[PDB]
Amino acid sequence: PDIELVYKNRGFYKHYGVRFGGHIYHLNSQDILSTAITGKSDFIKEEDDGKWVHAMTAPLDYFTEKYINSMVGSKHIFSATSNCETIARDLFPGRKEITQSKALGIIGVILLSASLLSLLAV
Amino acid sequence: GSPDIELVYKNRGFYKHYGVRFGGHIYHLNSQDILSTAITGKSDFIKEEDDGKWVHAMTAPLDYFTEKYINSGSKHIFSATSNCETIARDLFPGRKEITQSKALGIIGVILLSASLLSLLAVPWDYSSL
């Protein structure tokens, strides 16, 4: 099953999330600039409030090929509370090898990457 | 067939400032800070003689870079002086349909995108594209 990227407009950028069923997985971030420099983010799993905008639905491998272009990976440190312990099964169902830590890293870099590039859409 | 494009960079610590190396010169953006540049939404191109301090990132066909970075709405405006009037012939040889404006737009989005995404990369990973 595909990944659905969604966003909320935050004026000078878009804040992205992954919609799965009735929830959105996204980062607790006051703003992308601060987040990018500080190098750490906490994940939230929140009920869909109906105010997210559809961005794109595509296979996970479309997004990982585009943004996870390194078997070395990110400097960014991702954490999550236990309500995110569904993320591996939800977003990587077929993939037994994906631990929660790996899942957060992959999804987190996708969301941060999308948010950073949204700076160019003015 | 056309030569591959050589992406190079200078490390700025928190991110990498990328350029395209062709012969003895580097095409890159006049930018003190990548996030500042992205917010401003406009930048000027520079063509500079290679000072020997650029780091090799990746050599690849143009369409490797365009598939990765142009296949995802930039409204950034790229300008150049006549010092960049070689950019189309240098980086898009024998493609008459690539005007100067188009060449700046394509190379600009690649450099801005690579630079922005390097904010998330470990800073020593040269091949982080």
Author numbering:
A (entry chain B): 1 to 122
B (entry chain A): -1 to 70, 73 to 129
Excerpt from the publication:
Parechoviruses, including *Parechovirus A* that infects humans as well as *Parechovirus B* (formerly Ljungan virus) and *Parechovirus C* (formerly Sebokele virus) that infect rodents, belong to a group of picornaviruses whose 2A proteins, instead of being proteases, contain a conserved H-box and NC-motif and are homologous to a small cellular lipid-modifying enzyme (PLAAT3) that acts as a host factor, enabling the picornavirus life cycle. Despite the common evolutionary origin, 2A^H/NC^ proteins and PLAAT3 have no conserved function, as the active site of the viral proteins cannot support catalysis. Our structural analysis has shown that the topological rearrangement first observed in HPeV1 and leading to the apparent destruction of the active site configuration of the enzyme is indeed a general feature of *Parechovirus* 2A proteins. The C-terminal α5 region, which is a unique C-terminal extension so far only observed in *Parechovirus* 2A proteins, clearly plays a central role in determining the order of oligomerization as well as other correlated and sometimes far-reaching structural rearrangements.
